[PDB]
Amino acid sequence: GGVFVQSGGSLRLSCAASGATSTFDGMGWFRQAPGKEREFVSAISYEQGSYTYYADSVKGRFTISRDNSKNMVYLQMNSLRAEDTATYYCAPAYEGDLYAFQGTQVTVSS
């Protein structure tokens, strides 16, 4: 099972973010649609003002944020479309690249 959203709808994802280590300086999300390769979605730095990366496919619709007081990262997914259907994974980041060493399945109708 998973989440079901109508086209034009929205969804917020969240993940625990333990904080910066010598290995990792941020957190982000990737997704994998059925029969497709993993796709970068977004990554954010623990340091305010360092990176905020977005895939071109989600720019203007998705917003990544972090709350270092709560040790949390969030992804606000607005204006969802059928092509956003995928399983979404949170992973630690180093300079924006995501490192995966437990997904959220999302179906969007059109």
């Binding site: 970068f40 990366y53 995501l98 490192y99 995966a100 060493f101």
Partner: peptide
């Protein structure tokens, strides 16, 4: 060990 990397945008 082993890792899956998903690269940031080009």
């Amino acid at each position: 060990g082993s890792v899956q990397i998903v690269y940031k945008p080009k």
